[PDB]
Amino acid sequence: DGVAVSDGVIKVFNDMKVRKSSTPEEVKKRKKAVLFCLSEDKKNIILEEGKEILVGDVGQTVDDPYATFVKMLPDKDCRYALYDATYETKESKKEDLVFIFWAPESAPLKSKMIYASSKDAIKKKLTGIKHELQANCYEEVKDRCTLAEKLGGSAVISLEGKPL
Amino acid sequence: TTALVCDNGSGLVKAGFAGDDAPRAVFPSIVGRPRHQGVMVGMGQKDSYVGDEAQSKRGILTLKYPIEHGIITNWDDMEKIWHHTFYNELRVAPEEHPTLLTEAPLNPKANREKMTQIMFETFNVPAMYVAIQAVLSLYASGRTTGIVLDSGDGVTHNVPIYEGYALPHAIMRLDLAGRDLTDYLMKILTERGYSFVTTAEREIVRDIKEKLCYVALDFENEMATAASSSSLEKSYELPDGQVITIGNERFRCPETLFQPSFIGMESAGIHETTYNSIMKCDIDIRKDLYANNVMSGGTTMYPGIADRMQKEITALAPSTMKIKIIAPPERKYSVWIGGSILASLSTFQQMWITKQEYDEAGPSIVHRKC
Amino acid sequence: TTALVCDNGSGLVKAGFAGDDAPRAVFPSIVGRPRHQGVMVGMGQKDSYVGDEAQSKRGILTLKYPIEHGIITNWDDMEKIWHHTFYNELRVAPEEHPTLLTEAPLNPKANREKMTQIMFETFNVPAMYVAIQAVLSLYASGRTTGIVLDSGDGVTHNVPIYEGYALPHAIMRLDLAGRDLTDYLMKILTERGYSFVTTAEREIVRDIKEKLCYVALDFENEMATAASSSSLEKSYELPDGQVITIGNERFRCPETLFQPSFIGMESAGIHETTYNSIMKCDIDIRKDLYANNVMSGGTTMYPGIADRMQKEITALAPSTMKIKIIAPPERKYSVWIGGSILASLSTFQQMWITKQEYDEAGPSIVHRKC
Amino acid sequence: TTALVCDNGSGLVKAGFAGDDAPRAVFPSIVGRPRHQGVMVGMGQKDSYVGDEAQSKRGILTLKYPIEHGIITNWDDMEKIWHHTFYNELRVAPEEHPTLLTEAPLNPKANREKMTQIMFETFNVPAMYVAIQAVLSLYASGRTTGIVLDSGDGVTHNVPIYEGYALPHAIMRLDLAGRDLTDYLMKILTERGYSFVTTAEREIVRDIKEKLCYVALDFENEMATAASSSSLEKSYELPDGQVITIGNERFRCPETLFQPSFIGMESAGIHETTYNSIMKCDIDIRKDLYANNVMSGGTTMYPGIADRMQKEITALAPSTMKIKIIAPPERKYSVWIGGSILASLSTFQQMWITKQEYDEAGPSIVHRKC
Ligand SMILES: Nc1ncnc2c1ncn2[C@@H]1O[C@H](COP(=O)(O)OP(=O)(O)O)[C@@H](O)[C@H]1O
Ligand SMILES: Nc1ncnc2c1ncn2[C@@H]1O[C@H](COP(=O)(O)OP(=O)(O)O)[C@@H](O)[C@H]1O
Ligand SMILES: Nc1ncnc2c1ncn2[C@@H]1O[C@H](COP(=O)(O)OP(=O)(O)O)[C@@H](O)[C@H]1O
Ligand SMILES: [Mg+2]
Ligand SMILES: [Mg+2]
Ligand SMILES: [Mg+2]
């Protein structure tokens, strides 16, 4: 294991998982999809302010929340992710969050082992999360069908406001 | 501003906001403690698992339902499920939006008192209300007249409701529901060579009953067809890889709804309790109750249950009277639909029990208000 | 600061520090007393020889294994091997770094008690722990779900492990391992004109089995090819200078892993014990255990054992289920890899049994802790 | 004139005529194929060995039980055992005297159909009947009211029976029986240094459990006495000449009857299934079922099982109710006693299914008749 989580990531997770009554002007700067990284010393899990996605922009500048999210992941390094999905099932309409474990083969072993052995140190602190998505290849995470296959399987008819 | 409606059913928990068509949160209401020691160290092993995470890890868990036939047996896991569906599923706080709870009629007052106490002390909601599942399932129908056949996973109850005034003296309650059907299917599937003993396995039988069971138009001729040929048998794909061949069990275990003598109950089937309650009702409202039999719940989703209910009722009711069985295609969540259409009503917004009203009254305000 | 992990196996002793990839100390676990009087005077003749010095001087020694099928038969030579691998091989003291010992499941408690007593009384370690070889070999795989096929030199055992909770009621143990294969090869090599009776020679047969034996995809067709032509025969360079020509023995002695009736055992082969243990497991975890059969140990290093294991399991398992046989290229030391990756974990650092905890508890703390 | 009663149990076959007290034919129900080639020529080597001849020659055989937990797995050896107990043990023909077969409740219909087909086609009996083991074990008690705790070698089942009308909706079935106890004893005896892997050896463990195992009044204090001193340990004389020293295993493996979590089962122990079935029964018959808990089968022969069953039931049942545990000294064969006392009854002589009744009905008459 080793690497632990900081207070900022826990605060961001508690902010995203549990939403409250908010003003219409402030509700547009909520966090939609945020990644997690390591510092220079590789001892804390920190979110990078550079790569991120707001809830406000979704549906405006970002035509596709998932489509613009695949290219945001660097293919030469290992990354964490937290995607808030809004998929439509035949049965009903659900809105859950997804934990994406991005780990390409082109990344060095020093960044793969650290992020693989410390996955239980971050996933345990994220209470109440259910949908786990482990992705290693880029083609498997780039496809849109895999998210509906992991979330609900064949039952998910529409993903992110558009049919499959 | 918006109000939460939480149908804390015996088998599923339909939770969602008000003013929308479909419930966003749907999951089985079971908690699972880890059965084995757990040699592996780390990875986030937890003390409990609620809902879909329990369904996925049901192999190493010991699933159990906190709600029996409508009464809440265990309270710690019930409030745990409430906290889960509030925080880890909807990601909202109860302190902001008012919550709406549902229950079955002829319910012990201790259950409603504990519900109110948990909602007002642990979560500190601004306001709440405890409605009836059948009344809300009738709201979802858009009409106000007709008896409701509400049968979920733990209790089946019927309450006739006229043009706004319901009849509390004719409220029938039957402890026969989907859980009893699943138990009977497990008991009758051992005669084919498939033993389901453990709780985790029992969910496989539950899905088999959900997607392979139907109610016959009549029992005798369907048995005669079952006896002769395999034209009726159908195979199922088990999660382990094996296949099973069920025959008369496709329509024998749903017959318990109409013949309770299979699981041993002495209660009249769901086709006779409705007729007895209508015959206990007033003689002028019977003409309107006969042609309006609103069905709801997941147990009323068998293919052909509407036709058999019809046939049985016109067999019991006089010939001149016409029988109609309203079978909506969204009757699995009709209680939640009614709760959501009820929470948006302006006239109802005044009768929520509030904390300021709750302080001096204690946990006994719910009986006098609701 | 660093922790020692010592895989005291039946055939090899993999000992090394924590946090590194490969074990630095690897040698056979045998002690050799001098067989002959020793006329020459001086030169440093010793009472015993451990490991590589015994392998080099095996001509005049009488090699013997202190560990049978997992149980430690003799204790003086076992603690001698421990002192050797601690001082003459690693050049470190046990009083500074904590040691980690491994063992097979379904092990007599006396063995673990004597292990703890020897480690705490003779060496006086600050802390230690007794893990399971198969659980550690699963750690080395990086995953948490899947049954483990651990087969070393003395014991073959299988324990299915789900997403952190293992199933102790399905732990199968088979006394068939590499030593039995070597004995069978010695018994069937006499039919070609090569007699191996003595322990020292038996090591030559062990190396022959290590670098010339493979498991066939199927027994019948490979025998048909063995029967017809010498296309299968291959020669070997003996240390004495002679050459041998082995034929069907290249795939007959490894077949004992799947057909124990050759050495006389009545136990189901390694391909049937796994299926019987999975069929004894829960019905929801079978889908995940079928596609995860982690193999480890030196006996699983035969060319083609993975393909035969696959074929046999999909022959036993249902057709719709998919079978996967994880065959890592470092599965010979997978137990040590898992121990080393386990010792670096921060959460595990709290559950070491310490001397201060050991004093009042006696040698019985190991059963309640581990 | 006389009728044959054949209790084809999972571990023993009690076969005898009607109207007598004790069964004349008692032997284990296993068949043994010769394991080794058999170099000696002649002497009457046979393809199979059934019963006592298999028990005597179990060294060179591979024993196996045709009956699992109640279902008959293999049919050729089952009809072979039937032919044996009919001809080589009783020296009578089935064509003359009617036969009476027994079975456990919640049994697959295929087993009973194959039983009827084998009895009517291969042996051509004039008449037969398939009763229930627990109902007959209650007949042997001379009374008609009380729940039956029938636990043999493969299945443990409980059926409450009132003053002639039994309750089929409260029939509980537990797959935990003597075979599972023997497996658990074999698994926990390896911790002392005694490995029992093969089927032939397993019979030695079976006899050890039969004549050295007891059930404790409570688990905790007996463990405390086991932990301190050897006052509890007792030695056993093995057939090979060696002696073993078992300690807490004398009362740990019988505890599985009350705590199924040892072998991994999730089912409630035998002390909780009875209480749950009585609580599923009617509220007026509970007073009569609490004071009548008829026990039968060989598994209920442990010293002290009656006292623990009592204590547990009065711990579960209300205080005002009095609990009685009828522990007859011939409860090992109570099923056969009931069958023999049942076959002599004049009223029962009319409901035998006969060949003339069987012809047009086929093998499906047994479900509608019995
Ligand atoms: N398609 C279906 N066909 C038959 N039965 C079903 C189907 N879907 C669900 N059920 C049954 O309905 C039950 C769910 O009842 P539900 O309506 O959720 O009760 P509540 O509203 O009290 O939660 C399940 O136990 C299941 O057995
Ligand atoms: N390349 C190989 N091919 C086949 N068998 C091998 C090979 N290398 C080692 N073995 C066998 O594996 C055994 C070593 O088992 P090992 O994994 O050391 O058990 P443990 O982990 O209990 O010490 C040796 O006895 C040898 O017969
Ligand atoms: N004296 C005894 N003490 C404890 N257990 C016994 C004793 N005698 C027999 N048993 C157990 O009872 C089992 C026999 O069960 P049995 O009553 O023959 O079942 P069935 O009636 O179905 O044949 C044996 O497997 C044995 O383990
Ligand atoms: Mg309901
Ligand atoms: Mg090993
Ligand atoms: Mg019996």
CSV table of C-alpha atoms in Angstrom, one decimal, chain B residues 123-325:
chain,number,residue,atom,x,y,z
B,123,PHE,CA,-31.6,13.1,10.2
B,124,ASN,CA,-33.6,16.1,11.5
B,125,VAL,CA,-35.8,16.6,8.5
B,126,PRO,CA,-37.8,19.9,8.3
B,127,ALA,CA,-41.0,18.0,7.7
B,128,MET,CA,-42.3,14.6,6.7
B,129,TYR,CA,-45.4,12.5,6.2
B,130,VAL,CA,-46.4,8.9,6.4
B,131,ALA,CA,-48.9,8.0,3.7
B,132,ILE,CA,-50.4,4.6,2.6
B,133,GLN,CA,-49.0,2.7,-0.3
B,134,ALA,CA,-52.4,1.7,-1.8
B,135,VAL,CA,-53.8,5.3,-1.6
B,136,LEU,CA,-50.7,6.6,-3.5
B,137,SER,CA,-50.9,3.7,-6.0
B,138,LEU,CA,-54.5,4.9,-6.6
B,139,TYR,CA,-53.3,8.5,-7.1
B,140,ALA,CA,-51.0,7.3,-9.8
B,141,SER,CA,-54.1,6.0,-11.6
B,142,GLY,CA,-55.4,9.6,-12.0
B,143,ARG,CA,-58.8,8.5,-10.7
B,144,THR,CA,-60.3,8.7,-7.2
B,145,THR,CA,-62.8,5.8,-7.3
B,146,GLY,CA,-62.0,2.1,-7.1
B,147,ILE,CA,-60.5,-0.6,-4.8
B,148,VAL,CA,-56.7,-1.1,-4.8
B,149,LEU,CA,-55.0,-4.5,-5.0
B,150,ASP,CA,-51.6,-3.6,-3.6
B,151,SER,CA,-49.4,-6.7,-3.3
B,152,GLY,CA,-45.6,-6.2,-2.8
B,153,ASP,CA,-42.9,-8.5,-1.4
B,154,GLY,CA,-44.2,-8.8,2.1
B,155,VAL,CA,-47.9,-7.9,2.4
B,156,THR,CA,-50.9,-7.8,0.2
B,157,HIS,CA,-53.6,-5.4,1.3
B,158,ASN,CA,-56.8,-4.1,-0.3
B,159,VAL,CA,-58.6,-0.8,0.6
B,160,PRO,CA,-61.7,0.4,-1.3
B,161,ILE,CA,-61.8,4.1,-2.0
B,162,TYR,CA,-64.8,6.1,-3.2
B,163,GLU,CA,-64.9,9.6,-4.6
B,164,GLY,CA,-62.5,10.8,-2.0
B,165,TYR,CA,-63.7,9.0,1.0
B,166,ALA,CA,-62.1,5.8,1.7
B,167,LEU,CA,-63.6,3.0,3.7
B,168,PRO,CA,-61.3,2.0,6.6
B,169,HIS,CA,-63.7,-0.7,7.9
B,170,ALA,CA,-63.2,-2.8,4.8
B,171,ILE,CA,-59.4,-2.7,4.7
B,172,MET,CA,-58.3,-6.3,4.2
B,173,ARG,CA,-54.7,-7.4,4.8
B,174,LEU,CA,-53.1,-10.7,3.6
B,175,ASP,CA,-49.6,-11.7,4.7
B,176,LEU,CA,-49.2,-13.6,1.3
B,177,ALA,CA,-46.8,-11.7,-1.1
B,178,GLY,CA,-43.8,-12.3,-3.3
B,179,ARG,CA,-41.5,-13.5,-0.5
B,180,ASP,CA,-44.0,-16.3,0.3
B,181,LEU,CA,-44.1,-17.1,-3.4
B,182,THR,CA,-40.3,-17.3,-3.6
B,183,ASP,CA,-40.3,-19.6,-0.5
B,184,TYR,CA,-43.0,-21.9,-2.1
B,185,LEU,CA,-41.0,-22.0,-5.4
B,186,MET,CA,-37.9,-23.0,-3.5
B,187,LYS,CA,-39.8,-25.7,-1.7
B,188,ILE,CA,-41.3,-27.1,-4.9
B,189,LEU,CA,-38.1,-26.8,-7.0
B,190,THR,CA,-36.4,-29.4,-4.8
B,191,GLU,CA,-38.6,-32.1,-6.4
B,192,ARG,CA,-36.7,-31.5,-9.7
B,193,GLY,CA,-33.3,-31.9,-8.2
B,194,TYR,CA,-32.2,-28.3,-7.4
B,195,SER,CA,-31.7,-27.5,-3.7
B,196,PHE,CA,-31.8,-23.8,-2.7
B,197,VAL,CA,-31.2,-23.5,1.0
B,198,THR,CA,-29.1,-20.5,1.6
B,199,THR,CA,-30.3,-16.9,1.4
B,200,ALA,CA,-27.8,-15.9,-1.3
B,201,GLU,CA,-29.1,-18.6,-3.6
B,202,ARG,CA,-32.7,-17.7,-2.9
B,203,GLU,CA,-32.1,-14.5,-4.9
B,204,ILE,CA,-31.6,-16.7,-8.0
B,205,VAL,CA,-35.0,-18.3,-7.4
B,206,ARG,CA,-36.4,-14.8,-7.0
B,207,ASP,CA,-35.1,-13.8,-10.4
B,208,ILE,CA,-36.4,-17.1,-11.9
B,209,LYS,CA,-39.8,-16.3,-10.5
B,210,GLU,CA,-39.6,-12.7,-11.8
B,211,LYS,CA,-38.7,-13.7,-15.4
B,212,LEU,CA,-40.2,-17.2,-15.9
B,213,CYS,CA,-43.4,-17.4,-13.8
B,214,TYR,CA,-46.9,-16.7,-15.0
B,215,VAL,CA,-50.5,-17.1,-13.7
B,216,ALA,CA,-52.7,-19.4,-15.7
B,217,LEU,CA,-56.2,-18.6,-16.9
B,218,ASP,CA,-57.3,-21.7,-15.0
B,219,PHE,CA,-55.4,-24.3,-13.0
B,220,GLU,CA,-57.0,-27.5,-14.2
B,221,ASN,CA,-56.5,-27.3,-18.0
B,222,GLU,CA,-53.0,-25.9,-17.6
B,223,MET,CA,-52.1,-28.8,-15.4
B,224,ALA,CA,-53.5,-31.1,-18.0
B,225,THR,CA,-51.2,-29.5,-20.6
B,226,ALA,CA,-48.3,-29.7,-18.1
B,227,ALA,CA,-49.0,-33.4,-17.6
B,228,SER,CA,-49.0,-34.0,-21.2
B,229,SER,CA,-45.9,-33.0,-23.2
B,230,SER,CA,-43.0,-30.8,-22.5
B,231,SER,CA,-44.5,-28.1,-24.7
B,232,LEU,CA,-44.7,-26.1,-21.6
B,233,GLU,CA,-41.2,-26.6,-20.1
B,234,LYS,CA,-38.6,-23.9,-20.6
B,235,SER,CA,-34.9,-23.7,-19.7
B,236,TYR,CA,-33.0,-21.1,-17.7
B,237,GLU,CA,-29.4,-19.9,-17.7
B,238,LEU,CA,-28.0,-20.2,-14.1
B,239,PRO,CA,-25.1,-17.9,-13.1
B,240,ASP,CA,-22.9,-20.9,-12.4
B,241,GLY,CA,-23.4,-22.2,-16.0
B,242,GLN,CA,-25.8,-25.0,-15.4
B,243,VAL,CA,-29.3,-25.1,-17.0
B,244,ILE,CA,-32.6,-26.2,-15.3
B,245,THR,CA,-35.9,-27.4,-16.8
B,246,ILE,CA,-38.9,-26.2,-14.9
B,247,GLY,CA,-42.4,-27.5,-15.8
B,248,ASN,CA,-45.6,-27.0,-13.9
B,249,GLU,CA,-43.7,-24.8,-11.4
B,250,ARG,CA,-44.0,-21.9,-13.8
B,251,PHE,CA,-47.7,-21.6,-12.9
B,252,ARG,CA,-48.0,-23.6,-9.7
B,253,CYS,CA,-46.1,-21.2,-7.4
B,254,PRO,CA,-48.1,-18.1,-8.7
B,255,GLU,CA,-51.3,-20.0,-8.0
B,256,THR,CA,-50.6,-19.5,-4.3
B,257,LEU,CA,-51.9,-16.0,-4.7
B,258,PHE,CA,-55.4,-17.5,-5.3
B,259,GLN,CA,-55.0,-20.8,-3.3
B,260,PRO,CA,-53.2,-20.0,-0.1
B,261,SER,CA,-53.5,-23.7,1.0
B,262,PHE,CA,-50.2,-24.4,-0.8
B,263,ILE,CA,-47.9,-22.7,1.8
B,264,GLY,CA,-50.4,-23.6,4.5
B,265,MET,CA,-52.2,-20.3,5.0
B,266,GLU,CA,-55.9,-20.4,5.6
B,267,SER,CA,-56.6,-17.0,4.1
B,268,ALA,CA,-58.8,-16.6,1.0
B,269,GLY,CA,-56.9,-15.9,-2.2
B,270,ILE,CA,-56.4,-12.5,-3.6
B,271,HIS,CA,-59.4,-13.0,-5.8
B,272,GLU,CA,-61.7,-13.7,-2.8
B,273,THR,CA,-60.5,-11.1,-0.4
B,274,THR,CA,-61.3,-8.3,-2.8
B,275,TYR,CA,-64.9,-9.6,-3.3
B,276,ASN,CA,-65.4,-10.1,0.4
B,277,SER,CA,-64.2,-6.5,1.1
B,278,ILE,CA,-66.5,-5.1,-1.6
B,279,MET,CA,-69.3,-7.2,-0.1
B,280,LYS,CA,-68.5,-5.6,3.2
B,281,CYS,CA,-68.6,-2.1,1.6
B,282,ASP,CA,-71.7,-0.1,1.0
B,283,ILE,CA,-74.4,-1.3,-1.4
B,284,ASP,CA,-74.4,1.8,-3.7
B,285,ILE,CA,-70.6,1.9,-4.1
B,286,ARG,CA,-70.3,-1.7,-5.2
B,287,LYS,CA,-71.3,-0.8,-8.8
B,288,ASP,CA,-68.4,1.6,-9.0
B,289,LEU,CA,-65.9,-0.7,-7.1
B,290,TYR,CA,-66.6,-3.7,-9.3
B,291,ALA,CA,-65.6,-1.9,-12.5
B,292,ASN,CA,-62.5,-0.4,-10.9
B,293,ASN,CA,-59.9,-2.9,-9.5
B,294,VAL,CA,-56.6,-1.0,-9.5
B,295,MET,CA,-53.6,-3.3,-9.3
B,296,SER,CA,-50.1,-2.3,-8.2
B,297,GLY,CA,-46.9,-3.8,-6.9
B,298,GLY,CA,-44.3,-6.1,-8.4
B,299,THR,CA,-46.3,-9.3,-7.6
B,300,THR,CA,-49.0,-8.1,-10.0
B,301,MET,CA,-46.6,-8.3,-13.0
B,302,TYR,CA,-47.1,-11.9,-13.9
B,303,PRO,CA,-48.3,-12.5,-17.5
B,304,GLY,CA,-52.0,-13.3,-17.3
B,305,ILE,CA,-52.7,-12.3,-13.7
B,306,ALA,CA,-55.1,-9.6,-14.9
B,307,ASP,CA,-57.2,-12.1,-17.0
B,308,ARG,CA,-57.5,-14.5,-14.1
B,309,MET,CA,-58.4,-11.8,-11.7
B,310,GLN,CA,-61.1,-10.6,-14.1
B,311,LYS,CA,-62.5,-14.1,-14.7
B,312,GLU,CA,-62.5,-14.9,-10.9
B,313,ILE,CA,-64.3,-11.6,-10.0
B,314,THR,CA,-67.0,-12.0,-12.7
B,315,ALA,CA,-67.4,-15.6,-11.4
B,316,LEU,CA,-67.9,-14.2,-7.9
B,317,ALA,CA,-69.7,-11.0,-8.7
B,318,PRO,CA,-73.3,-11.0,-10.2
B,319,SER,CA,-73.6,-11.4,-14.0
B,320,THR,CA,-75.2,-8.0,-14.7
B,321,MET,CA,-72.3,-6.2,-13.1
B,322,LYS,CA,-69.3,-5.6,-15.4
B,323,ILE,CA,-65.8,-6.2,-14.0
B,324,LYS,CA,-62.7,-4.2,-15.1
B,325,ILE,CA,-59.2,-4.8,-14.0
